[PDB]
Symmetry: C3
Subunit: 250 residues, 3 copies
């Protein structure tokens, strides 16, 4: 699909690619600092094309082809980005497919738009992101990060291109945490997670499943899966999950 | 009712006329290139005045008293116009009355706002507008329109003041077609159609009725009715339909 | 909580104070010309802090720390202010606590956002405000106010700092009256009212209760309560009402 832009007033314009077709549509919500051109996004687009269903992928504010100053971006702004795509680009019932951060944000979207969002598929769902890990750190480290103004990440995160996080970003993200309360999502949910995920522990998907009020939640745990879940077999699992969900919803 | 304007940010301001009264209110959504001063709109306003119910009529972007450059208007922009009236002017439960294009757009509005829209009445509902006819044309004609950049309409459309349509407008309108999928409208629907309609075939209303998920859909076919459905007897049918629906909803 | 601002496009920015915590959150909607620093608002914030629940208080356009020209403010604009806080600041399920005008506006908010608003608590709910009293006045007085352009209020209103009201404000407020129709609120509602309220008669809360479609409405009438309901015992009643409702909703 070719490049379009959503004009927003007093918020940065968002770049997106849209495929015409049947509803329910699919919206792909990417991972942290990921643009819409990744392996999973493109694979989901090609599957929707073969099924004849509508599809949207897009770039967060500050990322890829979208407008915005990445230095000022926050989880809260990216949450509103998802809502802008859902409200102003998508029409009719939608299945959300969210990777990592995108899985955190798809939950917010389903809470906010319970009529329009008819199912959720998460991949390595990063609910409550790094706020969880920040608050598990010893208090002295928490005060060191605050004084420094940034958290320099453990080396395992460097393998994915993550290195530093501002203190202000962590504190803003606290407003968007969900695991301290029931998650009022009432639609079907499928949560895929690799058990060798070194960024988001697989147990996070079980915590999300437990908090979701919907009784219809499955967690699919892949023994040798890592955080990106983009090997050929992992793409096949994602496509099968989408195909089975569309069938069930029909 | 006297003339008011809805201020929108980075979208053209919309002209509307609003009558105070009881809810459910009625919103009249006009036909293609029709302003809010037509026979049916004024008749519905007078009926709501006699019943004591709230009522809104308005002009699409680019039309009548509204702002906007008509040359840049699209079905997608007019869809958002309807949503702007429903969100920013109307308060409480609404019955939508849509004529021609307005009947296509009322479906979008009910899909998008299922809590607020409590019933639909369509008149010569132009679901999927002229996209249907464009794609039924032979392929060579489709390429001729694309090369020319406009579709010069069959003469029968000239009788209503329709002559030419840009290719770009047709392709944008493809994003808003509904008949390829279930239409997730769950409220009562009444679809009036003249069987001698030379612009939108009466069978279109049966197709819409079949796709609507709501079990409560009636199609009223008037043997000698034409596209505008504005003879005195057709106005009486419309008012009776509104009155009977308000009674049923009470 | 410390002072934040909601940026709105082509509407005045709103000042608010937000407390992080569990959902359901609470939003306090203040009385006419009241800022967010009143006794009840602060008491509800302290209770939410002790319970660990999220909380928002805010200033209407034109009031307190918010932007806006108070001379141009209307009930309709303040209604949209409430919706802006609910949409753009609050996340997840909310209990609305509305005092006086705020109780009128919380009803609008629950009508407009039936998924997000999960309960209502009103204090001296001023449904249909002073429109009711204006239209009970003799016709000659109504024409005198119209010619003068303002209504100089009975002296009993002066005790609360209310003196004059523009005619234009009264007529705009007619658009937001609710008691002429069923009130399509479907959540639990608790309406507190002092029987010695000289500003809003206690019977107004019974009228609201009767019009609300929800079967789950209680009216709590305090024999010696006045309009502000801010004595220590009235604060205790409000906190107990919130605590009992959160328990019931859990
Ligand atoms: Sr812009
Ligand atoms: Sr850039
Ligand atoms: Sr800790
Ligand atoms: Sr299969
Ligand atoms: Sr404007
Ligand atoms: Sr013009
Ligand atoms: Sr064809
Ligand atoms: Sr009758
Ligand atoms: Sr602004
Ligand atoms: Sr000021
Ligand atoms: Sr009277
Ligand atoms: Sr107790």
């Amino acid at each position: 699909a070719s490049l379009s832009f959503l004009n927003r007033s007093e918020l940065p314009n968002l770049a997106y690619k849209r495929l015409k077709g049947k509803t329910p549509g699919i919206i792909f919500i990417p991972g942290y600092l990921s643009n819409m051109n990744g392996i999973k996004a493109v694979a989901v687009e090609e599957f929707c094309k073969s099924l004849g269903h509508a599809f949207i992928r897009f770039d967060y504010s500050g990322i890829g082809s979208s407008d915005g100053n990445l230095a000022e971006c926050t989880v809260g702004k990216w949450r509103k980005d998802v809502l802008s795509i859902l409200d102003d680009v998508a029409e009719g019932p939608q299945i959300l497919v969210g990777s990592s951060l995108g899985g955190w944000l798809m939950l917010h979207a389903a809470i906010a738009r319970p009529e329009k969002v008819i199912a959720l598929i998460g991949i390595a769902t990063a609910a409550d992101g790094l706020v969880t890990q920040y608050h598990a750190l010893p208090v002295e480290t928490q005060k060191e990060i605050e004084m420094k103004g940034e958290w320099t990440l453990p080396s395992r995160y460097n393998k994915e291109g993550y290195f530093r996080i501002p203190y202000s970003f962590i504190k803003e993200a606290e407003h968007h945490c969900l695991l301290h309360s029931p998650i009022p999502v009432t639609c079907p949910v499928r949560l895929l997670h690799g058990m060798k995920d070194e960024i988001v522990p697989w147990q996070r998907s079980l915590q999300v499943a437990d908090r979701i009020v919907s009784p219809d939640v499955d967690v699919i745990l892949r023994k040798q899966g890592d955080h990106r879940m983009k090997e050929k077999a992992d793409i096949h699992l994602l496509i099968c999950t989408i195909d089975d969900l569309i069938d069930k919803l029909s």
